[PDB]
Amino acid sequence: GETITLNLSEISVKTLGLDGFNVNGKGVTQNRSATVTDVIAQGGTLQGDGT
């Protein structure tokens, strides 16, 4: 009727929260200027003077 709850579990990655810990990546990636080629690529429709 008496015991001792030992209460031990789960020290590892995916539980210490890292699970993907990365230092290299490439940093804060910056986008490239979207242009008329990319606009017309995504089903864009011509409207006027480059619009």
Partner 1 sequence: VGADVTALANKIKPSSGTISGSYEISTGKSASFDVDAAGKITIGGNAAFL
Residues 50, 36 contacting (CB under 8 angstroms) = yes
Stretch that binds partner 1, among 4-12, 15-23, 26-34, 40-48 (CB under 8 A): 40-48
Q: Is the CB of 18 or the CB of 36 nearer to partner 1?
A: 36
Q: How many C-beta neighbours within 10 Å does residue 39 have? A: 13
Question: In the set 18, 34, 39, 40, which binds partner 1 (CB under 8 A)?
Answer: 40
Residues 34, 40 contacting (CB under 8 angstroms) = no
Q: Is the CB of 16 or the CB of 38 nearer to partner 1?
A: 38
